[PDB]
């Protein structure tokens, strides 16, 4: 319909060009006016004939909004045009829409205000948000406050606090400090939001509008126009209604009435039916007698004592009204059932009523599918489930398990992105059944356990958001306004309830009381029956809390330690907990280990021994032991004395004792030192003393092995770190703890060791004997049940003898199962290496000609001819005179003629048959790191294409078992060993975002491909499809502009830049002959400013907007793009990736993610080029505009801060991986440099990027990096090909 309207010059049968606009404007204005006052009764939009027309009304409104959006997209594409998204319309349509573009823009701007209201009424915040952003952008020159208010409300409905904060910061640069309150409310903090609302209203009105609430200090520690006043009041009322605080609602209403009477506002009025609130309060309180009377006044069908027309007439299409009606119907059915009970007497009608209610409640769910939303409403889903539960309980009388709500504790680890409102309805409908259970004599289902579990989960959710007021109520209800009140009121689900109470007390501020209660709970749990998930959790929480307040609890630990070798409540409680009867000795920790730190180790050890089935305790103990062991080892570089004295039967004794532990080939050095000092039992003494000062590593290794054995339950990032630490221990100190590794590596599984395979292969040349054998055995074992992981590297390395026997043994062990596959893969590798003649001859001739201006040339020619002796035969036959010509000329035009002929013949498409061809192969694809079921190659592409503007890249195509096309790309004469390590690093980094991705709509992921080397110079790089480069948009825009200017090829970036830098330099007094370094800064800045004023910044934003289908999809892709851009920018800044031109950045129109291509200029390599670059990443005008009207102050800044926090928290594993990459004999860094690169990366991660000793914070670092990447002083002095103006 939209296409027909646009293609028909707006001459639809509805009327003329202006008639359609007038009709749409009138309908939109009527809806907008009705939105302000519900008492309007809009014809054909608010009145229906039955329950079927109500859903149709909302459907029609949604369709109208979609039609308007499509119309706008088509008009924009008609007068401006797109690139690779929509086809260009005919010339007549473009010439007609180009002249009448101003009228269309004016009409859209005039109706945008009403469109926002209409979108808000239909429960479609995406439409109003997009329209608001467009309106704000168009207003570049008193309707500014209303627009911000509507956009803020819409964002709050979408649960996007980052966007709200960004808009607040953006608007602060133009009185509007109340936006932060809505931002906080969007996160689920109702108490803080309400308090802030009251404070703002009191400060803006002038009169005290505060109401009774919880302590302001405790609440904070835990977490002038009439329109603004009305909005704040309504928001506060809604906030109180959400937390189900009837008393607070009544107090707020009284305060509002008093304020209105004492201020004569005459414009403030709460838009909330108080009758419904009173009914809800009466129903929840158990007074059904008053509830029925209150319900008798609500509109709709009368209470049950006709079925199709249940909803009342004159109902607005607002989803809130529908939800209220559904809730009223459910309450009516519940009260009717309760009164009838105290079987087909009063059940024939209730069942029908509930059935109709359930059928009507499915409307929102069905509407959500009409658009690409990727999610379902929570309120509607819960209402439907509650209706179904009631329908089942009325017919079963609570006799089956289907009468309960499916909300279990499993949502704790999978529904962390929802507020506490979802559980309010569940608890409201569950308490009713619990109370009704007392009026049933027959056997029923156990609802007490379900009610307790549901209440506990809700309490945890409320506490996590700072809702102390609601959390206290839930805890009191499950257990059946001052800080001391909680302390004096709290101090199968027993352990969970106790832990929740302790957590609530700690969140309230009383940390000492919470810690003491947790210690007592742990003491009582240690003597329980199971004590599996309770003792470990309590000990871990207590240890974490103690670690947080280390400064304020340092004395208690010392006192406990002193008492243990010879006090406050916590001190004695911890002492009793540690001395609990069921490895660590004080003598070993007596050197280099602090007294209070030993308590943490004891706690971890006790938790591990008490709960050996959990992996968290083992990991914590291993980390603590490893850290302290490394510290004591680094800082270290009566029985012993008695043994030495007895074996040596005053200065001599002191010298011997000092030499025995001086700096513990070591045996020879010790013997020589002892002989030179004194002038054999010293060896035994040294061996016994070295083990004591080297015992923490043994415990760390044992704990790590045990933790890994349980993962054959934890995140991948938590396992990779352990594997890396174990490898480092086995590499650095191999002979000191070889006994533990000897049996440890002979029983560990191979599943968690598949993430450090390249490191294992690179560490196959360790100067040892058993270390090499152990690594080889581990790799061989890994080959079994998983041969597609070490197949390619082994065969590649096979084709010093240390790196030869291991490879031979690995290939021999891997070939004992499927020898045919091994031989076929070897043949394929050989063919690929041999398919990397004409090019070699051309290169040799060019090099010889360039170096000509002798014996070297003759030797090179002879060697090339000897090496070169389907396609080879043809080349040899057509160029068989090269040898004869060279021999004749040896005693030189032949070389020039051959080079010219080769160059002329060079100027693509090849064939696989001419350069063998297998089928039904069993060889794995090149790179299957993430593949549950390996896919074997089935065929090869018949033709191979070549790519220009490069050395020699060849694009191919492969087929798998599932008939899927997997293209690749060849790379010869260019080592790709560093790219593999970079990709591995990126994968490890992405693994850290697995936890944060469980409660966030935009996933934190960094797109990357897989690369595999085929020796020393060859290489196969994966091909990523579906991504479009950013340079295409600029090229298309240039072509469109040229075509438009022609009526009334395109220049390259270098030519365009020179056309502007020439005249400027000539006018300033200089010339083009001057060096680029000696160039004025003002000239470059002026040229850049003039160039940016010509390229519009909507090339990328409009592209993404036109590539979508519905507003929800547009919002989702926009958020995903912003998050992806922030993640990529932070990763590039940390690594130091440079040369990020438009051809090295690709955008995915399907999801909006950004992916890089050339990972060559990295590790701060662009600063040493001919034209150094100082910008950390690409923050061009188009990139900034594509992030929204806010820019870099909304989701971009918050995402960058979160990414930096994640990277800084786990920088140990990243540093270890980088160190391993440095000591890699297969990596060619030059193409002490590696040490410098590692030091730079470490400095960047530690926050000391540019500072002598000051450590910049995350916020400061983000601000400095953003400022350094956006200042015009750095973008002007850059390479021409970087395209800094687009
Ligand atoms: C419009 C023209 N294009 C953009 C230039 S494109 O190539 O044709 C194209 C590319 C993709 N995406 C894609 N996917 C996988 C790989 C590559 C790719 C392309 C070129 N070079 C490399 C490369 C080269 C060298 C190194 N290594 C070192 O430099 N030092 C060790 C690493 C990588 C990788 N690109 C999608 C569509 C299109 Cl059309
Ligand atoms: O209340 P819980 O359900 O037991 O959640 C806790 C904890 O919550 P608290 O921060 O309130 O103590 C953290 O939950 P999130 O902050 O991620 O939402 C989480 O990780 P952190 O403690 O590091 O923040 C993790 O604790 P841990 O990682 O130490 O195991 C978890 O504990 P459980 O997973 O054992 O339930």
UniProtKB/Swiss-Prot annotation:
All residue ranges annotated as the PI3K/PI4K catalytic domain in the record: 940-1231
Full protein name: Serine/threonine-protein kinase SMG1
General function of this protein: Serine/threonine protein kinase involved in both mRNA surveillance and genotoxic stress response pathways. Recognizes the substrate consensus sequence [ST]-Q. Plays a central role in nonsense-mediated decay (NMD) of mRNAs containing premature stop codons by phosphorylating UPF1/RENT1. Recruited by release factors to stalled ribosomes together with SMG8 and SMG9 (forming the SMG1C protein kinase complex), and UPF1 to form the transient SURF (SMG1-UPF1-eRF1-eRF3) complex.
Subunit details: Component of the SMG1C complex composed of SMG1, SMG8 and SMG9; the recruitment of SMG8 to SMG1 N-terminus induces a large conformational change in the SMG1 C-terminal head domain containing the catalytic domain. Component of the transient SURF (SMG1-UPF1-eRF1-eRF3) complex. Part of a complex composed of SMG1, DHX34 and UPF1; within the complex DHX34 acts as a scaffolding protein to facilitate SMG1 phosphorylation of UPF1. Interacts with PRKCI. Interacts with TELO2 and TTI1. Interacts with RUVBL1 and RUVBL2. Interacts with UPF2.
Whole-protein coverage range: 920 to 3661 of 3661
Region (Catalytic loop): 1136-1144
Region feature (Activation loop): 1156-1180
Domain spans labelled FATC: 1254-1286
Localization, UniProt: Nucleus; Cytoplasm
Entry comment on modification after translation: Autophosphorylated.
HEAT repeat intervals: 751-786
Domain FAT, chain residue ranges per copy: 320-799
């Amino acid at each position: 319909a939209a296409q027909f309207t646009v293609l028909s010059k707006l001459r639809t049968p509805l009327g003329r060009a202006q008639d359609t606009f007038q009709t749409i404007e009138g309908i939109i204005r009527s809806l907008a006016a009705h939105t302000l006052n519900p008492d309007q009764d809009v014809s054909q939009w608010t009145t229906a004939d039955n329950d079927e027309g109500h859903g149709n009304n909302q459907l029609r409104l949604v369709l109208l909004l979609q039609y308007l959006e499509n119309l706008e997209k088509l008009m924009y594409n008609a007068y401006e045009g797109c690139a690779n998204a929509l086809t260009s319309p005919p010339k007549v349509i473009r010439t007609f829409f180009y002249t009448n573009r101003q009228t269309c823009q004016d009409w859209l701007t005039r109706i945008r205000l009403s469109i926002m209201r209409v979108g808000l009424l239909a429960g479609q915040p995406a439409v109003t948000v997009r329209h608001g952003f467009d309106l704000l952008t168009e207003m570049k020159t008193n309707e500014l406050e209303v627009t911000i208010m509507m956009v803020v409300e819409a964002l709050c409905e979408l649960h996007c606090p980052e966007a709200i904060q960004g808009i607040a910061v953006w608007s602060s640069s133009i009185n509007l400090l109340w936006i932060n309150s809505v931002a906080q409310q969007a996160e689920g903090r109702f108490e803080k939001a309400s308090v802030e609302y009251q404070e703002h209203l009191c400060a803006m009105t002038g009169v005290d509008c505060c109401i009774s609430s919880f302590d302001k200090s405790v609440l904070t520690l835990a977490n002038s126009s009439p329109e603004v006043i009305n909005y704040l009041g309504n928001k506060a009322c809604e906030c109180y209604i959400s937390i189900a605080d009837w008393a607070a609602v009544q107090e707020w209403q009284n305060s509002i009435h008093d304020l209105k009477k004492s201020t004569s506002s005459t414009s403030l009025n709460l838009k909330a039916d108080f009758n419904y609130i009173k009914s809800l309060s009466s129903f929840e309180s158990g007074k059904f007698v008053e509830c029925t009377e209150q319900l008798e006044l609500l509109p709709g069908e009368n209470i049950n004592l006709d079925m199709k027309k249940l909803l009342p007439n004159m109902l607005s299409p607002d989803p809130r009204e529908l939800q209220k009606s559904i809730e009223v119907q459910l309450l009516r059915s519940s009260v009717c059932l309760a009164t009838a009970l105290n079987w087909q007497s009063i059940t024939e009608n209730v069942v029908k009523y509930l059935k109709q209610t359930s059928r009507i409640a499915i409307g929102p769910l069905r509407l959500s599918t009409l658009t690409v939303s990727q999610s379902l409403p929570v309120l509607s889903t819960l209402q439907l489930y509650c209706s179904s539960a009631l329908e089942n309980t009325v017919s079963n009388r609570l006799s089956t398990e289907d009468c309960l709500i499916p909300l279990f504790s499993e949502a704790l680890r999978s529904c962390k992105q929802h507020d506490v409102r979802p559980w309010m309805q569940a608890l409201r409908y569950t308490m009713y059944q619990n109370q009704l259970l007392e009026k049933i004599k027959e056997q029923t289902v156990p609802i007490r356990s379900h009610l307790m579990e549901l209440g506990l989960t809700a309490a945890k959710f409320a506490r996590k958001r700072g809702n102390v007021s609601l959390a206290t109520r839930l805890l009191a209800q499950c257990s059946e306004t001052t800080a001391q009140d909680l302390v004096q009121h709290f101090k199968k689900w027993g352990p969970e309830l106790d832990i929740e109470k302790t957590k609530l007390l700690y969140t309230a501020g009383q940390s000492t009381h919470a810690m003491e209660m947790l210690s007592s709970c742990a003491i009582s749990f240690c003597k329980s029956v199971k004590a599996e998930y309770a003792v470990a959790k309590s000990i871990l929480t207590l240890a974490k809390w103690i670690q947080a307040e280390w400064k304020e609890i340092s004395g208690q630990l010392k006192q406990v330690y002193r008492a243990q070798h010879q006090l406050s409540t916590l001190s004695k409680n911890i002492l009793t907990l540690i001395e609990l009867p069921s490895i660590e000795s004080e003598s070993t920790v007596h050197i280099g280990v602090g007294e209070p730190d030993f308590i943490l180790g004891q706690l971890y050890h006790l938790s591990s021994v008490q709960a050996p089935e959990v992996a968290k305790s083992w990991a914590a103990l291993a980390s603590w032991a490893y850290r302290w062991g490394r510290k004591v080892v680094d800082n270290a570089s009566x029985x012993x004395x008695x043994x030495x004295x007895x074996x040596x039967x005053x200065x001599x004794x002191x010298x011997x004792x000092x030499x025995x532990x001086x700096x513990x080939x070591x045996x020879x050095x010790x013997x020589x030192x002892x002989x030179x000092x004194x002038x054999e039992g010293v060896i035994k003494v040294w061996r016994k003393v070295v083990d004591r000062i080297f015992s923490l590593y043994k415990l760390s290794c044992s704990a790590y092995f045990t933790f890994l054995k349980l993962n054959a339950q934890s995140t991948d990032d938590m396992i990779v770190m352990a594997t890396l630490r174990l490898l480092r221990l086995l590499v650095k100190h191999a002979g000191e703890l070889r006994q533990y590794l000897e049996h440890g590596l002979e029983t560990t599984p191979t599943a968690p060791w598949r993430g450090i395979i390249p490191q294992l292969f690179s560490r196959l040349n360790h100067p040892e004997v058993y270390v090499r054998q152990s690594i080889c055995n581990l790799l061989c074992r890994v080959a079994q049940d998983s041969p597609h992981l070490i197949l390619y590297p082994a065969i590649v390395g096979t084709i010093q003898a240390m790196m030869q026997d291991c490879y031979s043994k690995i290939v021999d062990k891997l070939s004992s199962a499927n020898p045919t596959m091994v031989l076929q893969v070897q043949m394929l590798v050989a063919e690929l290496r041999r398919v990397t003649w004409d090019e070699l001859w051309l290169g040799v001739l060019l090099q010889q000609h360039m170096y000509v201006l002798x014996x070297x040339x003759x030797x090179x020619x002879x060697x090339x001819x000897x090496x070169x002796x389907p396609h080879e035969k043809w080349f040899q036959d057509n160029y068989g005179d090269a040898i004869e010509n060279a021999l004749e000329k040896l005693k030189x035009x032949x070389x020039x003629x051959x080079x010219x002929x080769x160059x002329x013949x060079x100027x693509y498409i090849l064939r696989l048959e001419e350069i063998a061809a297998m089928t039904n192969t069993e060889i794995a694809l090149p790179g299957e790191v993430s593949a549950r079921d390996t896919v074997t190659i089935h065929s090869v592409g018949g033709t191979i294409t070549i790519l220009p503007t490069k050395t020699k890249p060849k694009k191919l195509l492969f087929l798998g078992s599932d008939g899927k096309s997997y293209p690749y790309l060849f790379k010869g004469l260019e080592d790709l060993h560093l790219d593999e390590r970079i990709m591995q690093f990126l994968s490890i980094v992405n693994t850290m975002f697995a936890t944060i991705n469980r409660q966030e709509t935009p996933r934190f992921h960094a797109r990357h491909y897989s690369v595999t080397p085929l020796g020393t110079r060859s290489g196969l790089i994966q091909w990523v499809d579906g991504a479009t480069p950013l340079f295409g948009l600029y090229k298309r825009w240039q072509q469109r502009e040229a075509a438009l200017q022609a009526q009334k090829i395109v220049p390259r970036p270098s030519e365009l830049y020179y056309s502007k830098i020439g005249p400027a330099l000539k006018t300033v007094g200089l010339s083009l002959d001057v060096s680029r370094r000696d160039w004025p800064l003002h000239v470059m800045k002026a040229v850049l400013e003039e160039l940016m004023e010509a390229t519009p910044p909507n090339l990328l934003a409009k592209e993404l907007w036109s590539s979508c289908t519905t507003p929800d999809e547009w919002w989702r892709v926009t958020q995903s793009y912003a998050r992806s851009t922030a993640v990529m920018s932070m990763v590039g800044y940390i690594i130091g990736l440079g040369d990020r031109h438009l051809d090295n950045v690709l955008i995915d129109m399907t999801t909006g993610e950004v992916v890089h291509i050339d990972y060559n200029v990295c590790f701060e390599k662009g600063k040493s080029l001919r034209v150094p670059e100082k910008v950390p990443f690409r923050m061009t005008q188009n990139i900034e505009t594509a992030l929204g009207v806010t820019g870099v102050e909304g989701v971009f800044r918050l995402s960058c801060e979160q990414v930096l926090h994640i990277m800084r928290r786990g920088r140990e594993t990243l540093l270890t991986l980088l160190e391993a990459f440095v000591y890699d004999p297969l990596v060619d860094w030059t193409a002490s440099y590696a040490v410098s690169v590692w030091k730079r990366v470490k400095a960047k991660l530690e926050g000391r990027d540019v500072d002598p000793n000051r450590r910049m914070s995350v916020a400061e670092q983000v601000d400095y990096v953003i400022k350094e990447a956006t200042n015009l002083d750095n973008l002007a002095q850059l390479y021409e090909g970087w395209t800094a103006w687009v």
